[PDB]
Amino acid sequence: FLTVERMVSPIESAEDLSKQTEIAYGTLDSGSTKEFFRRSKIAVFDKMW
Amino acid sequence: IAIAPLTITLVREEVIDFSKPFMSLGISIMIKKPQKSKPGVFSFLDPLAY
Amino acid sequence: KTVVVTTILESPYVMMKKNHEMLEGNERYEGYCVDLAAEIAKHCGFKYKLTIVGDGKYGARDADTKIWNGMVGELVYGKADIAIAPLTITLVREEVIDFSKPFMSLGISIMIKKKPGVFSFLDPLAY
Amino acid sequence: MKVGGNLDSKGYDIATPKGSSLGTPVNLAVLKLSEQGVLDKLKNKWWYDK
Amino acid sequence: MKVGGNLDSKGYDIATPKGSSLGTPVNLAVLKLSEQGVLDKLKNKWWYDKGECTSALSLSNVAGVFYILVGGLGLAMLVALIEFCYKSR
């Protein structure tokens, strides 16, 4: 229990959020952020989209 | 021209012309993703070998 | 007319027999490509003579002089009638000669290298 | 999940009618695409990325 | 050991001169050979047939303490017999 509790690391960056799946993440239905996510070429943002 | 996952066979080569294969594949095995099995009755002896 | 089969020496593809010196002809060679060529010759009913490429190179264009080397060069310049060897199918070779349907599929792969002490129970604490 | 390697070897290719002028250009285009690495990009996009 | 999958896809093919009568039937021959399965037979025959080839704690991890225990037992026996012989004499 204690080792697992120590091992967990809070998400402090984009790819930590992206590779992980337990905690969801969202964006506005219609906005510049959604366009950026759609028309992106970097791998991390691609799999996020 | 036929652009689709068409398998290259001897008969098809006999009738039509095939380019070099753009993607290779074979026969493989799909099994259900393994799950945590129920521990055995005498599973407390597991840390030490018999 | 007998067909010259031009080959590059490479294991398992072709090898030198242990008794290659006393033997003569295609029996001097044994390998993957010789068996493949035997099957092809049986299918097409022609006699073939095995010959190893002189320079022992797979083949690559030299942009300064534009002369093919290796088995591709042997085929282009008429020294060979058919090549049965581990020759990769690429663009440069494709535009100059005819490649059959690939008989052996391959790719880049990773190769890795694959007993505690008697008094190993003392490791957790320093000496 | 997929377990083990491939039992046999097969490939998917682009088909062209017998005695046509598109066979050789399509063939060399397929090899140029494979050597360039676009095909692996497409496979990764349509299988893993998406 | 080879580990993982092939990163890309290539192949080995029979090469013949441009515009040769030997191309079409050698291609038919290699395809027929692959479909007949003899090609896989050749692959297995010279790659494998002529080839030349846990979580729980094991006893080897604790063999040293067993050796120490047996040595201590033997030393205790030796001491006991020494004392017995000395007292008897």
> What is the interface size between C and D, counted as CB pairs within 8 Å?
15
The nearest alpha carbon in chain B to D31 belongs to: B20
State the sign of the Cα–Cα–Cα–Cα dihedral E32, E36, E42, E44. Answer: positive
DSSP symbol at C24: -
Q: Which one, of C77, C73, C28, lies nearest residue C50 by Cα?
A: C28
Concatenating the DSSP letter of every residue in B3-46 gives EEEEE--HHHHHHSEE---SEEE---EE-PPP-PPPPPTTGGGT
Neighbours of A42 (CB within 10 A): 9
How far CA E75 is from CA of C69, E65, E70, E71, E85, in Å, comes to: 79, 15, 9, 6, 15
Packing angle of the helix pair E23-36, C32-44 (nearest 10 deg): 110
SS3 per-residue string spanning chain E? CEECCCCCCEEECCEEECCCCCHHHHHHHHHHHHHHCHHHHHHHHHHHHCCCCCCCECHHHCHHHHHHHHHHHHHHHHHHHHHHHHHHC
CA pair distance A42, A32, nearest whole angstrom:
17
Rounded to the nearest angstrom, the gap between the alpha carbon of residue E80 and the centroid of all alpha carbons in its chain is 51
> C56-85: b or e for each residue (b if 16 or more CB lie within 10 Å)?
eebbeeeeeeeebbbbbbbbbeeebbbbbb
The nearest alpha carbon in chain D to E34 belongs to: D9
- CB contact at 8 A, C91 and C17: no
Concatenating the DSSP letter of every residue in C28-72 gives GEEEHHHHHHHHHHHHHT--EEEEE-SS-------TTT----HHH
Asked whether the beta carbons of residue B19 and residue D18 sit closer than 8 angstroms, the reply is no
Asked whether the beta carbons of residue E11 and residue B48 sit closer than 8 angstroms, the reply is no
Determine the distance in angstroms separating the CA of B20 from the nearest CA of chain C, rounded to an integer: 7
Q: Which residues of D touch C106 (CB under 8 A)?
A: none
Note whether D35 contacts A: Cβ–Cβ < 8 A. no
What tokens does D11 get? 């490939």
Q: Is residue B12 annotated as involved in ligand binding?
A: yes
Q: Residues 6 or more apart from B27 whose CB is under 8 A from it? A: D6, D7, D8
Q: Å resolution of this model?
A: 3.6
Which of C87, C97, C105 comes nearest E17 by C-beta? C97
Asked whether the beta carbons of residue C100 and residue E42 sit closer than 8 angstroms, the reply is no
The amino acid at B32: K
The amino acid at E30: V
Asked whether the beta carbons of residue D31 and residue C89 sit closer than 8 angstroms, the reply is yes
The amino acid at E40: D
Three-state DSSP class for residue D2: strand
Determine the distance in angstroms separating the CA of E59 from the nearest CA of chain C, rounded to an integer: 10
CA pair distance C46, C30, nearest whole angstrom:
19
What is the H or E stretch that residue D41 is in?
Answer: helix D38-44
> B4-36: b or e for each residue (b if 16 or more CB lie within 10 Å)?
eebebebebbeeebbbbbbebbeeeeeeeeeee
The nearest alpha carbon in chain D to A42 belongs to: D49
State the sign of the Cα–Cα–Cα–Cα dihedral E56, E59, E64, E69. Answer: positive
CB contact residues (below 8 A), chain E span 15-54, against chain B: 27-28, 31-32, 35
Asked whether the beta carbons of residue D16 and residue B22 sit closer than 8 angstroms, the reply is no
Asked whether the beta carbons of residue B20 and residue C89 sit closer than 8 angstroms, the reply is yes
Cross-sheet strand order for the sheet of C3-7 = C48-52, C3-7, C82-83, E15-17, C97-99
Asked whether the beta carbons of residue D37 and residue E9 sit closer than 8 angstroms, the reply is no
Show the CA angle centred on residue C56, arms to residues C52 and C57, nearest 5°. Answer: 125
D10-16/C29-31 β-pairing: unpaired
Task: Say whether the E–B interface has 3 or more Cβ pairs within 8 Å.
Answer: yes
Q: Which one, of C41, C35, C72, C34, lies nearest residue C55 by Cα?
A: C72
Checking phi first, is residue B49 left (phi over 0); if not, alpha (psi -120 to 50) or beta?
beta
CA pair distance C105, C66, nearest whole angstrom:
29
Determine the distance in angstroms separating the CA of B47 from the nearest CA of chain E, rounded to an integer: 5
Q: Is residue B47 annotated as involved in ligand binding?
A: no
Asked whether the beta carbons of residue C99 and residue B8 sit closer than 8 angstroms, the reply is no
Q: Which one, of C3, D20, C73, lies nearest residue E25 by Cα?
A: C3
